[PDB]
Amino acid sequence: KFDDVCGCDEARAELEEIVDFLKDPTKYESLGGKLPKGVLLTGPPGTGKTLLARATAGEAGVDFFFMSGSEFDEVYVGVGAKRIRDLFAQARSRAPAIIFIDQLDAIGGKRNPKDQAYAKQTLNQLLVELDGFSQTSGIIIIGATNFPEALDKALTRPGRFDKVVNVDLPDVRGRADILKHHMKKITLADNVDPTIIARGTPGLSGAELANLVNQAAVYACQKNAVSVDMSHFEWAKDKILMGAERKTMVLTDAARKATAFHEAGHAIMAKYTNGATPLYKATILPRGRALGITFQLPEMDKVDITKRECQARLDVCMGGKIAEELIYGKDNTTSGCGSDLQSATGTARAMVTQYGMSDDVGPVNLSEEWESWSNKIRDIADNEVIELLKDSEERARRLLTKKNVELHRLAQGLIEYETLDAHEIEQVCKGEKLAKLKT
Amino acid sequence: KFDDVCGCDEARAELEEIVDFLKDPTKYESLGGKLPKGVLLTGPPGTGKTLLARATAGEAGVDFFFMSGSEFDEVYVGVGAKRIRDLFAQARSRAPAIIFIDQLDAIGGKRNPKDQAYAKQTLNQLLVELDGFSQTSGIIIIGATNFPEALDKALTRPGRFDKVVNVDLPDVRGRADILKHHMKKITLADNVDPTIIARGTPGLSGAELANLVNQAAVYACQKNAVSVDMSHFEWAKDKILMGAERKTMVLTDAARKATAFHEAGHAIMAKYTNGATPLYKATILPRGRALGITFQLPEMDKVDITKRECQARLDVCMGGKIAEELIYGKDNTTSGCGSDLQSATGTARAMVTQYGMSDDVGPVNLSEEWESWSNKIRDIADNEVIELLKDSEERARRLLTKKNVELHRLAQGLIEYETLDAHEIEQVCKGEKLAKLKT
Ligand SMILES: Nc1ncnc2c1ncn2[C@@H]1O[C@H](COP(=O)(O)OP(=O)(O)OP(=O)(O)O)[C@@H](O)[C@H]1O
Ligand SMILES: Nc1ncnc2c1ncn2[C@@H]1O[C@H](COP(=O)(O)OP(=O)(O)OP(=O)(O)O)[C@@H](O)[C@H]1O
Ligand SMILES: [Mg+2]
Ligand SMILES: [Mg+2]
Ligand SMILES: [Zn+2]
Ligand SMILES: [Zn+2]
């Protein structure tokens, strides 16, 4: 049912006019309008594309044929074309039907006159079937895909795929709508306000919210409880944003002290730098595949990114290296740092090539066809990148030398306790002990 | 039939005169002429090729066998050639007939030394059947392909496919004729002038104008209207040129302020810049996947582009980031500007590599085989491009320095009054008040 697709109102509409166009044509086809020959659905993974298609097949009332985009090419030459001829043959052999081909990437790759062969023999047959010499009517076709630009230009033409519909990640309102829908059919308690969960999950799809509610319910029943409450939703939310924790893996005191100084370094570097994102939990329990992680959670779920925020992030990604390099001396820096060091490099490149934030290079886009530029401009670009990185390192140590006391105090805070909230990090920096258990 | 194909009157003339040959040969077989042995049809997607094939099949008054390039080549070896032999056996058997192999991209592939010994058997049979040893007369063949150069050289050889006919995207008058044709099924109002819309859609094929009319009609019938009128055509044309409207979005006032300053920058750089394309409406309502777009629009749809107009395009691309720099200081530049830069760089390269508009590079075409020139001239070229872009952005920055008052005036005129129009933009840039409510 179309009510099961909460959020993405435009896409649900733009299939819903097709459905109610089928149910009573004369309310729409009076002035000469007629059925659209095809809807395309594009967007990231896990947003509601296949869901919307299953809802259209549920509320339409006409015969609905579905196939993946990979059930065509078995191992000979000309087997896919035969299966499209028989697919549309069965399709037009009855009333106005709908034909949902899912994963349209697998037969939608654009044909390029360099090696075109038996490979593109299925696509040409689909093209001749959608809009060919013999004009049939009544057949609608719906196809989904993660990759709109890989598709041919002869598929995305009007007359074959009349309208294009993009289903992407929801915002806070639609997000709270999705949670309100999945908080049904679970024995909630009071205390549960889905707007609160929606404010704290920037950048989650529908599949991840629904998974949140599900494993929160299972965790509720496994504690022998009676109703689901904000502690459970908070737990599962942490299991999605950070990773499953592990209260095992016995390890020495020198190691856990070292990690305490590493994550202490990221935290202090991220809490006193103008432009950094707001802070979140900062543990040393090995959760996920990492040995402790300082997570940051935005609130206004931005789409763009300024320059000060890029430099602030670029400084957060080195507080561990500079931290343990200021405590344990220089010849004792380990090799774990390199991992997060990796990510810093990526940011710096986007600041120079794509986004255009270096005055020495210019306001030019060296990003795509990086291999077409000469060697001088790439020398200047890469030199600019490295200058950004080491400048950020210098800022980081200049700051961690004047915040030494908060560094040690917070290190002991992470070594006595295992985790810390945000304001718990603040008070542990100030020095007032927290109301909880020293593990 | 041939009156249904509005625009591309040359191809229409060729096929009209072929069918006119099949009507009364004596007007043409006096001086000894004989029919063309073949007509090929090339052009981009959606420009009316299969349509002309339908017209000639409908009016030729003789048999008309049609197939696709993919209805050959099933599992076993030598079945495609077999089907071609039987196709021309039926063709010879029936009458003076016509044969339409739609989508010749499949079987008309280029021959090369590295084909796997069985790919080009169908093609070779098609060649020994068209102008082989046992010559005959009475069979005409028509073919359609998007990729004329991707065809073998023995299919295009006169004797086989005498006439190479070139369907192409219409000009202004052609679009007027297409719209006037397709509006004959729409219950129209009296405020409809297709010349306006034809002047509004510079670059659309015939199919896109078709479903433009269709969606305008269907939208007219959603609003409980009585006749499709000009505002509806405006709605649908805007939908196709920019995308859906996406009414339901939560927008912090700082966000939509910053956006209004970005498109304010583009609009001013396109307003007072010599040679820039005349300005159409500039909105900040979140259309499609962009958060606001200023949309320029030409007048006389020329194909050439002078050097003045090119530099105008570069400046129009730099105006946005220059706006954010002038208002929010330099550190507060976002990453949305990347989508601007990526376009401008493109134009810059066309000014230097292929259009021949530089002084140090020369009057030479460095475009084709870019990877084959030396490393010195590519250094010179890329230095030239970088200089073009830098000079562009500095011109933009002092232009927006002189027009600061109008910049704030139009930014505030966009935070209020969503989606101004060009005339309305000029009224806002002086201080008038618009004859319409605020949102
Ligand atoms: N708007 C929504 N309302 C309710 N549930 C949603 C919504 N959007 C997504 N979901 C959840 O997402 C799941 C289906 O995801 P979907 O199949 O749409 O992803 P997808 O677009 O197919 O991704 P991929 O193309 O990578 O498979 C459902 O189980 C559903 O619970
Ligand atoms: N010149 C025209 N006059 C009227 N209608 C047109 C014209 N050109 C295209 N159309 C519309 O386009 C449709 C068919 O387009 P056509 O099949 O010619 O594209 P095509 O040449 O096959 O492109 P492709 O080969 O990429 O599919 C028709 O249904 C018709 O409504
Ligand atoms: Mg799916
Ligand atoms: Mg065609
Ligand atoms: Zn780290
Ligand atoms: Zn822009």
UniProtKB/TrEMBL annotation, chains A, B:
Its cofactor is Zn(2+). One of its GO terms (molecular function) is ATP binding. The keyword Membrane applies. Mg(2+) binds at residues 50, 102. Its main location: membrane. The keyword Lipid biosynthesis does not apply. This is AAA+ ATPase domain-containing protein.
